[PDB]
A paper describes a structure:
Bet v 2 is a plant profilin panallergen, i.e., it is ubiquitously distributed throughout nature and shares a highly conserved amino acid sequence of up to 75% even between distantly-related organisms. Additionally to its ability to bind actin, profilins also interact with poly-l-proline and phosphoinositides. In this study, we present crystal structures of Bet v 2 in the reduced (without disulfide bridge) and the oxidized (with disulfide bridge) states at a resolution of 2.0 and 1.7 Å respectively. The reduced and oxidized structures were determined at a high resolution of 2.0 Å and 1.7 Å, respectively. Both structures share a central six-stranded antiparallel β-sheet with two N- and the C-terminal α-helices flanking the sheet at one side and a third helix flanking the sheet on the opposite side.
While the overall structure was conserved between these two forms, the crystal structures revealed marked differences near the N- and C-terminal segments, which are linked by the disulfide bridge Cys13-Cys117. In the oxidized form, the N-terminal segment is disulfide linked to the C-terminal helix, which adopts a strained conformation enforced by the disulfide bond. The poly-l-proline binding sites of Bet v 2 map onto the immediate neighborhood of the Cys13-Cys117 disulfide bond, providing a direct link between the differences in proline binding with the differences in the crystal structures of both Bet v 2 forms. Hence, the apparent higher binding ability to poly-l-proline of the oxidized Bet v 2 can be explained by the conformational selection principle: the likelihood for the ligand to find the receptor in a conformation suitable for binding is increased if the conformational space of the receptor is restricted by a disulfide bridge. In this work, we showed that cathepsin S degrades the reduced form of Bet v 2 rapidly, whereas the processing of the oxidized form is sufficiently retarded. Given the significantly higher proteolytic resistance of oxidized Bet v 2, we suggest that this form is the sensitizing allergen. Importantly, however, the two redox forms differed strongly with respect to their proteolytic resistance, which can have major impacts on the immunologic properties of Bet v 2 for several reasons: firstly, given the long storage times of birch pollen proteins before the contact with a patient, the preferential degradation of the reduced Bet v 2 will accumulate the oxidized Bet v 2 form, resulting in a preferential exposure of patients with the more stable oxidized Bet v 2 form.
Residue numbers in the entry: 2 to 133
């Protein structure tokens, strides 16, 4: 199906298989969902607007926190205009910007930052190399 293909060939695939602890998504710059893991949260349009703004001005979200699905993440050091990172509890969030889209990964213990980040980098490079 489309969603098994998404869960298998694209989104964070942490053992379970697909245990609820890790989730990822590809979201257009305009806030439309291109693909998301079965566990990925619903999010609000203005959360995407604020994230896009932080890619233009890194640290835009730091005083208020970064919100996704209503959850507040503390902004940490990222890569200006390319990657946003945030922490919450035992996990966090990584967002990579591509030409037309954003790649999200959300993780919690025992999923590690490195595990999630490897998937987010992989999907972002795949999109960028397709021209997206």
């Amino acid at each position: 199906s489309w969603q098994t293909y998404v869960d298998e060939h694209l989104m964070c695939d942490i053992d379970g298989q697909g245990q609820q602890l890790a989730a990822s998504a590809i979201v257009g710059h305009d806030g439309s969902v291109w693909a998301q893991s079965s566990s990925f949260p619903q999010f609000k349009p203005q959360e995407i607007t604020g994230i896009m703004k932080d890619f233009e001005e890194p640290g835009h979200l730091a005083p208020t926190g970064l919100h996704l699905g209503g959850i507040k993440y503390m902004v940490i050091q990222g890569e200006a205009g390319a990657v946003i990172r945030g922490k919450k509890g035992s996990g966090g969030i990584t967002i990579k910007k591509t030409g037309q889209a954003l790649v999200f990964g959300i993780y919690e213990e025992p999923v590690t930052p490195g595990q999630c980040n490897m998937v987010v980098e992989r999907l972002g490079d795949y999109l960028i190399d397709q021209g997206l």
